[PDB]
Amino acid sequence: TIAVTGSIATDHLMRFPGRFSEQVSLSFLVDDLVMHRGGVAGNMAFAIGVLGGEVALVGAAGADFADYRDWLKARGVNCDHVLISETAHTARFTCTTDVDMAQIASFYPGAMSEARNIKLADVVSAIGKPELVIIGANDPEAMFLHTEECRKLGLAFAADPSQQLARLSGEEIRRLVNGAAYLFTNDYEWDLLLSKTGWSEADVMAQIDLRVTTLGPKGVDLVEPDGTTIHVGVVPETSQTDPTGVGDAFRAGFLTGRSAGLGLERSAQLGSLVAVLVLESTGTQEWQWDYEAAASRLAGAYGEHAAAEIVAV
Amino acid sequence: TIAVTGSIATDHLMRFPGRFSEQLVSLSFLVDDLVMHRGGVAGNMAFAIGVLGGEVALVGAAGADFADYRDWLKARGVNCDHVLISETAHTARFTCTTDVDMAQIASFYPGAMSEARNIKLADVVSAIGKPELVIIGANDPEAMFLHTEECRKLGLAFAADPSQQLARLSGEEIRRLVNGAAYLFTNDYEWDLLLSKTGWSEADVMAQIDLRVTTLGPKGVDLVEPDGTTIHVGVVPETSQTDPTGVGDAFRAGFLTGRSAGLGLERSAQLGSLVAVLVLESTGTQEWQWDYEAAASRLAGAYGEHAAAEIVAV
Numbered sequence: 001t002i003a004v005t006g007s008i009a010t011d012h013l014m015r016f017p018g019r020f021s022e023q024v025s026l027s028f029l030v031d032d033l034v035m036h037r038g039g040v041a042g043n044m045a046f047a048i049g050v051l052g053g054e055v056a057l058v059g060a061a062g063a064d065f066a067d068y069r070d071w072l073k074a075r076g077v078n079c080d081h082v083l084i085s086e087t088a089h090t091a092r093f094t095c096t097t098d099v100d101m102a103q104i105a106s107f108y109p110g111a112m113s114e115a116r117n118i119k120l121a122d123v124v125s126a127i128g129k130p131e132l133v134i135i136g137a138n139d140p141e142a143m144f145l146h147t148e149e150c151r152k153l154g155l156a157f158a159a160d161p162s163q164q165l166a167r168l169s170g171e172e173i174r175r176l177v178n179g180a181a182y183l184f185t186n187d188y189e190w191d192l193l194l195s196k197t198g199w200s201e202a203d204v205m206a207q208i209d210l211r212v213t214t215l216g217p218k219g220v221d222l223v224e225p226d227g228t229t230i231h232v233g234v235v236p237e238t239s240q241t242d243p244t245g246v247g248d249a250f251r252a253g254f255l256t257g258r259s260a261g262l263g264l265e266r267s268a269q270l271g272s273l274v275a276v277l278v279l280e281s282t283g284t285q286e287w288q289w290d291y292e293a294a295a296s297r298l299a300g301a302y303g304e305h306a307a308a309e310i311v312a313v
Numbered sequence: 314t315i316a317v318t319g320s321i322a323t324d325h326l327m328r329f330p331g332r333f334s335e336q337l338v339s340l341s342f343l344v345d346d347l348v349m350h351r352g353g354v355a356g357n358m359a360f361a362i363g364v365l366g367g368e369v370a371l372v373g374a375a376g377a378d379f380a381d382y383r384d385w386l387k388a389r390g391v392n393c394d395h396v397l398i399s400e401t402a403h404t405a406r407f408t409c410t411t412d413v414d415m416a417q418i419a420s421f422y423p424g425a426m427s428e429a430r431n432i433k434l435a436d437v438v439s440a441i442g443k444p445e446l447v448i449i450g451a452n453d454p455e456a457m458f459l460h461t462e463e464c465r466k467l468g469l470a471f472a473a474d475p476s477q478q479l480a481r482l483s484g485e486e487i488r489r490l491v492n493g494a495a496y497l498f499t500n501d502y503e504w505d506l507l508l509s510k511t512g513w514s515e516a517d518v519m520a521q522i523d524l525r526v527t528t529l530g531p532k533g534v535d536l537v538e539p540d541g542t543t544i545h546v547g548v549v550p551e552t553s554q555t556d557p558t559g560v561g562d563a564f565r566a567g568f569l570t571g572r573s574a575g576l577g578l579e580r581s582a583q584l585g586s587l588v589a590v591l592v593l594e595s596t597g598t599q600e601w602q603w604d605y606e607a608a609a610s611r612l613a614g615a616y617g618e619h620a621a622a623e624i625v626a627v
């Protein structure tokens with residue numbers, strides 16, 4: 001029922017056992033190199049499926065996507081509407097993370113550029129109207145066209161530009177916001193969005209139903225247009241390792257909770273749990289779902305009643 | 314016969330259509346090119362020496378994925394008999410993004426390279442005679458040290474070529490790699506860093522080596538003898554530069570091939586300059602092509618018809 005649009009990628013994740021704060025010819029001797037499934041839509045679809053949601057992945061990959069497809073389908077993700085390029089290869093994200101969880105990365109779009117040829121009308125015709133479509137980081141034209149299709153067909157959507165906010169222009173960003181049921185960013189991305197669009201906090205809130213702003217170690221804010229604000233602190237980490245995909249994980253947990261009928265605070269607590277589980281894994285989809293560990297850490301952070309309510313659904 | 318020790322790698326080379334100088338931590342570069350190529354300093358130098366017609370043996374550590382690389386190098390005359398193939402590790406991986414101004418941001422995962430420390434140059438000598446020259450290139454640090462020590466004890470002339478690993482090695486580690494070298498190869502930044510980290514002066518270094526070779530990017534190369542005798546060779550000017558990866562390896566290979574062919578220092582450096590610009594004008598370090606006529610033409614344009622004729626003769 002949730003249609004996740006955005007990048008599908010292979011992540012090449014490396015660990016630099018030093019600090020980027022020190023330091024043109026930058027060279028980092030890394031002590032770990034692993035290749036994992038990635039892309040924001042891949043990550044969010046994977047998490048929603050693992051959590052038991054009904055989710056369809058809508059993006060563009062290369063012909064190398066068969067194993068990824070099996071991996072996602074095994075966890076309930078509908079991959080029928082993944083466009084497979086006959087010529088391009090699946091996008092490649094390459095990232096080096098340092099001791100302080102800082103990151104230096106490159107992204108090669110490849111097949112992602114063909115997402116602009118996807119029509120959400122076909123997905124609707126094939127599996128009904130989605131209850132929510134996530135307009136995630138993607139081919140910029142695909143992001144715009146997907147948002148426009150949502151506006152035209154009456155589909156509720158979540159604006160989730162994250163990684164692509166730096167590459168989109170102010171007008172391109174303004175075109176992605178109006179009418180969104182949700183706006184997802186981190187706090188840096190929130191400030192950058194405001195600065196690039198020229199909009200004020202109020203200008204933005206007048207156009208959306210809810211602003212969700214993640215705050216890294218300080219948790220997340222959920223802000224309604226009338227100023228009503230819920231702050232949810234983190235599920236504190238105990239073995240953080242790589243911050244790649246943490247935002248995707250939070251969005252997936254949160255939206256799965258909402259789809260299950262939980263309130264904003266409870267859904268955000270679930271999102272916080274999934275986010276820390278990703279933070280404590282290298283790959284974005286390398287985390288494991290343990291019901292008991294989930295209940296325990298949720299209870300430790302938010303209370304037994306909150307944990308019980310969350311794990312019930 | 315030249316024995317090239319150093320890294321064997323797969324290079325993942327990307328092009329950023331912007332300037333790192335502007336983005337100057339959560340750096341993200343949208344790149345418009347991504348290609349995977351054969352690399353490693355020893356791979357590159359051995360490949361270039363083989364393409365130029367030299368007798369060259371590659372001595373390094375790769376993973377079990379090395380079969381196609383092995384065929385690629387053997388097809389160019391390279392002896393790969395003494396490449397150690399790790400039973401468990403994978404071939405090292407270099408990942409690099411180059412911007413519009415040829416600046417680079419890169420990561421290097423050693424992997425199987427770490428096992429080079431298990432290689433005995435005594436076996437290479439026993440198998441193919443004493444090498445004319447052993448290149449101690451960027452490698453597993455312990456392998457670099459042990460290779461230099463084995464050259465010293467077996468009486469093999471060697472070239473200190475630490476380049477990329479100079480930042481990793483400590484001052485004492487660097488000092489242990491220099492004494493007795495027939496050649497010291499660095500670029501100018503690496504030269505200054507070597508001096509600062511070892512605490513040695515220019516004179517301290519020159520007292521221990523037979524020749525200093527310092528590349529200068531667009532300003533060419535200096536070849537400096539211990540008595541101060543200096544040859545400066547300007548570049549073969551580029552016309553389609555694209556990626557600077559492997560340019561130093563290419564220069565070293567052309568230069569040493571010229572020396573092995575009996576050319577003087579200036580002529581050998583002119584040949585090295587040619588190979589270096591050909592690599593600069595290719596993406597991968599071994600993606601360049603040897604064209605005899607284009608070589609003669611650009612050599613002549615840069616250095617004179619007689620110099621070009623002398624070089625291309627050998």
Ligand SMILES: Nc1ncnc2c1c(I)cn2[C@@H]1O[C@H](CO)[C@@H](O)[C@H]1O
Pocket residue numbers: 007009010011037038039040043092093105106107137138163164244245246247248284341342343
């Ligand atoms: N510019 C982009 N456009 C689309 N997707 C992007 C990027 C970048 I920068 C990284 N990624 C993907 O985001 C995931 C982590 O959130 C990772 O899995 C990674 O693949």
Ligand SMILES: Nc1ncnc2c1c(I)cn2[C@@H]1O[C@H](CO)[C@@H](O)[C@H]1O
Pocket residue numbers: 100101215216217234235236237240243246272275276279
């Ligand atoms: N649950 C947690 N507990 C403690 N710190 C957290 C988290 C989470 I989710 C994120 N972080 C910090 O925020 C950045 C990545 O989002 C990184 O800087 C990371 O350290």
Ligand SMILES: Nc1ncnc2c1c(I)cn2[C@@H]1O[C@H](CO)[C@@H](O)[C@H]1O
Pocket residue numbers: 027028029320322323324351352353354357406407419420421451452477478558559560561562598
């Ligand atoms: N630290 C290192 N140790 C050994 N080899 C290294 C590095 C680094 I940084 C890059 N390379 C290799 O050098 C080649 C270009 O000269 C490229 O082909 C690349 O594979």
Ligand SMILES: Nc1ncnc2c1c(I)cn2[C@@H]1O[C@H](CO)[C@@H](O)[C@H]1O
Pocket residue numbers: 414415416529530531532548549550551557560586589590593
């Ligand atoms: N043959 C040439 N003609 C002009 N410039 C050259 C060369 C060569 I070999 C190197 N360079 C300069 O060095 C940088 C890469 O090392 C390059 O980015 C460039 O600044």
Ligand code: NA
Pocket residue numbers: 242243244245246278279280281282283284
């Ligand atoms: Na992660």
Ligand code: NA
Pocket residue numbers: 556557558559560592593594595596597598
């Ligand atoms: Na190159």
